Write a protein that binds this ligand. Sequence first.
Ligand SMILES: *C1=CC(=O)[C@H](C/C=C\CCCC(=O)O)[C@H]1/C=C/[C@@H](O)CCCCC
Ligand SMILES: [Mg+2]
Length: 224
Amino acid sequence: VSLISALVRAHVDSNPAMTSLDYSRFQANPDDTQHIQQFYDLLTGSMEIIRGWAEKIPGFADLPKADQDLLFESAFLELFVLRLAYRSNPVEGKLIFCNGVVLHRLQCVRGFGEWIDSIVEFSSNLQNMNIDISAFSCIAALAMVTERHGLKEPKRVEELQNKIVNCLKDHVTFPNYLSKLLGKLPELRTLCTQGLQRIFYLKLEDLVPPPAIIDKLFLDTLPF
Ligand SMILES: *C1=CC(=O)[C@H](C/C=C\CCCC(=O)O)[C@H]1/C=C/[C@@H](O)CCCCC
Ligand SMILES: [Mg+2]
C-alpha cells in the first residue's frame, strides 16, 4: 500500500508486456493518408491507457473531475513521449507503442515528421541515465501531478506532488542525480510543443483532419 509501490504498480499495469509485443507491422527498412491516420490512432489509443494510469495514482481519483481532466489533458503529450521513450529501443530505431506495436523510426517519419527524431533522441538520453522502474514511476507521476492554472484544489495537487518528490528523494538515497532527473521534466515540455507543432502542420495541411478528441484537445489548449 506504500506510495512508491502504488506508483510502480500504476506504471507496470498500464504498459505492454515485453513478452507479448506486436512485430506484425514492423519494417527495419520501409519503402500519405494512412501514415497520418496511424499517427492519430497512436495518439488516441494512448489516451485511454494514460488516463487509466492516472486513475491509479493515489489521491488522483480523489480530485474533482475538472481537476483530473485539467491535469491529464495538460500532461498527455508529455506522458505519451516519456512512456514511449522509456519503453523503446533507440539504439535500434525501434519505437514500442502502448498497445505493444513495434514500428521502426523510418516507419514513423511520414506521420510524426521531425518529431520522432526528437523523441528517439530523447529516448537515447533518458535511457543513458539508467533510471530504474521506481524512479521512473515517480518522474512520470510528477509530469502530471503539478500545479496548473484553473485547479479547484491546487493545495491537494501541491501536497500530492511533494509526497512523490520525497518518494523519489528517499529512493535516490536508497543529491546530484536528482536534479538531472527532475531536469527531464522541462525537456518534456519542449517535446510536447513539438507534438503540438506537428498537429498544427497536419491540420493546416488538411489532408486528414484530426479525429474529434485530438481536435478538441488541440484547440482548447492553445492559449491564442
Ligand atoms: C505541452 C507543451 C505545450 O505547448 C502545451 C502547454 C499549453 C498550455 C499550458 C498548460 C499548463 C496550464 O494549464 O497551466 C502542453 C501540452 C498539452 C497537450 O497535452 C494538450 C493536448 C494536445 C492535443 C493532442
Ligand atoms: Mg483558435
